[PDB]
Each structure stands twice: as C-alpha cells, then as structure tokens.
Amino acid sequence: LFPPQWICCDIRYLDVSILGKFAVVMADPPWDIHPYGTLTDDEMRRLNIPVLQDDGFLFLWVTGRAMELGRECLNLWGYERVDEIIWVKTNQLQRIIHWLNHGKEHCLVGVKGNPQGFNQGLDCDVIVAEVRSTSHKPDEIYGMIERLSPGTRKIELFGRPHNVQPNWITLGNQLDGIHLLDPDVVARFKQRYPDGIISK
Amino acid sequence: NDYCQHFVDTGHRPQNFIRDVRELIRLKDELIAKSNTPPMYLQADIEAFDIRELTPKFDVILLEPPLEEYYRKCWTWDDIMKLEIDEIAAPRSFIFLWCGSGEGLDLGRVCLRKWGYRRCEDICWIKTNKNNPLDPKAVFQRTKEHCLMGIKGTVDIDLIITEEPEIGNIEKPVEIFHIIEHFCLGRRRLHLFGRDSTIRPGWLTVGPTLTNSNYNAETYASYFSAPNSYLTGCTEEIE
Ligand SMILES: CNc1cc(N2CCC[C@@](O)(CNC(=O)c3ccc(CN4CC5(CCC5)[C@@H]4C4CC4)cc3O)C2)ncn1
C-alpha cells in the first residue's frame, strides 16, 4: 500500500513471513566489521531473507570484510550477484570527499528467480551524490529502484526513520513504533502478534 | 540535484560531473624513478608457459588477463584461476587483479583466495562518457571496472576517473601504475598480460603479444642482489 510503512523491531526475531513477497529487498546491515549494535556473522547468515521474495532483486550494502561476507550471505540466501553499484561521495562542489583513502561505498545487487517486467538498464551503476549524516545512504538509490521496478512492493532491512518511503516497508530497531496500512499485512500481523509484542 | 535522473534523461553518466579529477609530492615520484630497475619484458604464451621460470619471487604482481567482456585469445575465469600465481609470489607480496565488471568481481575474489591473498582494497576505474553521451544478467548499465588489491603475508584514493576508451581499446588507465608505485611495496614488479604499449621502467612485463624480449633471469635477479634486496622502491639507491 502506496504510503510509507514501518515496524520497529529486532530483525533477528521478527517473523518476516507475515510481510508477504517483495519485488525488491534492500539491506544496510550492521555488519560486525572491526558505534552501534552489531550482528554476528552467523546471525546475518540466519536472517530469513529467503521467504521475502520469489522473483526479484536484492540490494546489499557492504564495506570492509563484509564485501566478502555479504557475497556469502547473498549466495546462501539464494541470490546471484549480478551487479555492484558504487556511490562516489562528493561535497557540494562535486569534489570527492587502510592502504588507500576511500572515495566510495559499495552496494551489491543480487537476483533471485526470474524477475519479469523490470526496467533493467535504465540507470548506470555509479551514483555521484553529496554526503550527509554519517551512516546515511544516498536517496538516489530509491529513485533507481523505483525506475527499475515501478509501483511494486519493496522492503528495507535495518533502515532508520529517514528511510521510510512510499511503496516501502521499513524495518529497524530505531523506528518509532509500528505503522502498517496494507490490510493483508495488518491482518497477518494481528494473528502472529495479537498483543503487539515481538519477542524471542 | 539527482545525477541518476539526469543520466536517464540525457545519457550523461553521473561521473561526468565530478570536478577536479600537501604541496608537491613529486620528490616521492623522483625517488621511485631513481630506484626503478630497467624495463624488462618477455614474450610468452602464458597458457603454455611454465610460470616457474619467472624468478625471483615478486613483490607486486599486476594481472590483466584479457576477458571476453573487453570485446564486442580471450581468457575465461576458468583459465585464470588455473594459473599457479602462488608459485611466483614472494611470501610477503601484493597482487592487483583487473576483474572487469561482471562475474569477475566474484571469481576474482576466489582467485585471490586460491593463491593465498586477502583483499584489502577495491580500486574502481570509473569511465566518463563526456564525449559520447549489455550483459543479459545486468540490472544496470555498467560504467566501471574493478581492480582488486590483495595482500599475502605480514596519499591515494581508491578511484580512477577517465573517459571511456574507444571501442576495441583494451588498455587500462596508466594511473593504476602510479597507485601501485606510490605504495612503496618493493622493487620486483611483474605485469602479466602486459603489452608493448605497457612496458615501463621498474616493471617486468610478460604477455603473449609482446614483439620483443630482453628478459634474462640472471640479469633480472642481479638488480636485487645485496645490498639491494629489501628496498621499497621509494628510497635512495645504495651507494
Ligand atoms: C540486533 N537487531 C536489529 C538491529 C538493527 N539496527 C542496529 C542499530 C542501527 C539501526 O537501527 C539502523 N541502521 C544503522 O544505523 C546503520 C548505520 C551505518 C551503516 C553502514 N552503512 C551506511 C552505509 C553508507 C551507505 C550505507 C554503509 C554501508 C556498508 C557500506 C549501516 C547501518 O545499518 C539498525 N535493526 C533491527 N534489528
């Protein structure tokens, strides 16, 4: 259902089967790279990503060793990595912000099944955009995803309140409560969680 | 303003609009040029070539196999991953592997791990199309190539921005050599699948299309005999 929706929760424990199937998944996980609460490698492997889609695309932000671990989860969860987006970070004058200085962030792109009716090839795999608060992904990614798969249902894992978007259901443990509008989701949520608590 | 939208509207890639791409650094460049070994090079069909013949073991390997995707002999990742790179890499050494933009970003990581390296950097060559504003699996137009840096054993940015070369031009940006040489990683530098056009002081180039050779294993090793065995390639020569 078109307007923004979100669920404050521990993504480790929420029964994501109540949410239905999504054309696009995006995740910016708290990888345990060597600031916030982290998820162990095993917890990320165990996330029930496979129930979320049948045919569609996964967008998986990665840095450091999660460039490798993210590829492992991606394949474990049943996806093939078919693209990799980079966001070149600039200032407001369009200048770029271990062994090398890091001018970019990486977003892996995975496919599951055989998605039909997507507009593949409309955008290119480089995003140039101005940095904002630490830990924010650039808003351009939502436009690229909308053009790729307009009007379909989408879900974001480990998002924050600024990430809530129309057509998207946002999950994260710093969201303000639960805000669901889709009736099938509202229905399945009430069954699975009749007292509105999400534990164990 | 949204450069992704701008690209879908006009065809000008987002990277076309990046601008400007402590005092001097040139003295470092001068020290590098001073300690550079003479250029050495060898024509060799690397499929058939026993790579063991290449000695001594190298401090840096730059590996640039000719992938099929660079066109339209090509090397598959099947071919590349069967190269015995760990036989010629020094126990502490570095690899820079051009992986393209497709399955190479995954299979190249398998290769690095196969040969005993861990990836420490992902260097992205971003191609502008200022002058001229399609894999079945591709979701997006691919406008970049990745060069993976691996380490084994115990000033620059990780982006290279140049205009996309003309069709059929396979050369990679010479800037990758600057990044490598500025790391001061040692002086035994090997470039596998280089060409006449890539030969460069401080480097041993080995590839099938070279037209001439001057490689001599004993001459090559004499450039690193004592007292020159452990120089970083960034310091004064030893008097
Ligand atoms: C235990 N169970 C949970 C946890 C949970 N948490 C934990 C607390 C925080 C949050 O609430 C919201 N997220 C973040 O603060 C958050 C911040 C930064 C990054 C790094 N990303 C940012 C970029 C730059 C472009 C995208 C990079 C990227 C690697 C290249 C990732 C993040 O996810 C999620 N939510 C539900 N259940």
Q: DSSP characters for A87-131?
A: EEEE-TTS-B---SB--EEEEEEEEES---S--TTSSBSEEEEE-
Expressed in Å, this structure's resolution amounts to 2.3
Distance A4 CA to ligand 1 centre (A): 19
Distance A3 CA to ligand 1 centre (A): 23
Contact between A139 and A130 under an 8 Å Cβ cutoff? The reply is no
* Phi, psi for residue B217 in degrees, rounded to 5: -60, -45
Distance of alpha carbon B90 from the chain centroid: 17
Query: CA-CA distance, B4 to A123, in Å (whole number)?
Result: 6
Count how many Cα atoms sit within 13 Å of the Cα of residue B29 in the half-sphere of its side chain: 7
Tell whether A191 is in a known binding site. Answer: no
Number of domains into which chain B is organized: 1
Residue B138 covered by a domain: yes
Q: Which of B3, B161, B82, B72 is nearest to A124 (CA)?
A: B3
Experimental approach was: X-ray
Q: How far is B53 from chain A (nearest CA, A)?
A: 31
Tell whether A101 is in a known binding site. Answer: no
Contact between A5 and A182 under an 8 Å Cβ cutoff? The reply is yes
Inter-chain CB proximity A99 and B149 less than 8 Å: yes
A124 chain-B contacts, CB cut-off 8 A: 4, 7, 13-14, 140-143
Residue B64 covered by a domain: yes
Contact between A145 and A174 under an 8 Å Cβ cutoff? The reply is no
Tell whether A160 is in a known binding site. Answer: yes
Inter-chain CB proximity B139 and A57 less than 8 Å: yes
Residue B230 covered by a domain: no
- A76 part of contact set with chain B, CB < 8 Å: no
Residue B234 covered by a domain: no
Residues in chain B: 239
Residue B112 covered by a domain: yes
Residue B26 covered by a domain: yes
Coil, strand, or helix at residue A186?
Answer: helix
Question: What amino acid occupies position A110?
Answer: G
Q: In the structure, how many helices (H) and strands (E) does chain A have?
A: 4, 9
Distance A107 CA to ligand 1 centre (A): 14
Distance B86 CA to ligand 1 centre (A): 38
Long-range Cβ contact pairs of B179-182 (< 8 A, separation 24 or more): B179/A100, B179/B123, B180/B60, B180/B62, B180/B94, B180/B96, B181/B32, B181/B233, B182/B28, B182/B32, B182/B155, B182/B156
Nearest-CA residue for ligand 1 atom 19 is A135
> For the sheet containing B89-100, what is the strand order?
B40-43, B204-207, B189-192, B58-63, B89-100, B144-152, B118-128, B159-163
Q: B47 is written with which tokens?
A: 């499929």
Which residue range is the domain that position A150 belongs to? 1-200
Nearest-CA residue for ligand 1 atom 7 is A37
Contact residues for A65 (Cβ-Cβ < 8 A; gap 6+) = A31, A33, A34
Contact between A25 and A59 under an 8 Å Cβ cutoff? The reply is yes
Residue B235 covered by a domain: no
Coil, strand, or helix at residue B9?
Answer: helix
- B149 part of contact set with chain A, CB < 8 Å: yes
Contact between A64 and A32 under an 8 Å Cβ cutoff? The reply is no
> Which chain B residues in 106-145 lie under 8 Å from chain A, judged by CB atoms?
106, 109, 119-124, 126, 134, 137-144
CATH number of the domain within which B112 lies = 3.40.50
Distance A39 CA to ligand 1 centre (A): 10
Contact between B215 and B97 under an 8 Å Cβ cutoff? The reply is no
Q: B95 is written with which tokens?
A: 């690899």
User: Nearest 5 degrees, angle CA A73-CA A62-CA B67?
Assistant: 85
Query: CA-CA distance, B128 to B144, in Å (whole number)?
Result: 9
**H/E segment holding residue B91:** strand B89-100
Nearest CA in chain A to B126: A126
Which residue range is the domain that position B149 belongs to? 3-222
Question: What amino acid occupies position A147?
Answer: R
Number of domains into which chain A is organized: 1
Q: How far is A191 from chain B (nearest CA, A)?
A: 37
- String of b and e for B2-40 (b: at least 16 CB within 10 Å)? bbbebbbeeeebbbbbbeebeeeeeeeeebbeebbbeeb
Tell whether A173 is in a known binding site. Answer: yes
Query: CA-CA distance, A73 to B10, in Å (whole number)?
Result: 36
Query: CA-CA distance, A100 to A113, in Å (whole number)?
Result: 37
Q: Any residues with Cβ below 6 Å from ligand 1, and which?
A: A 10-12, 28-30, 36-37, 39, 61-63, 105, 135, 137, 158, 160, 172-174
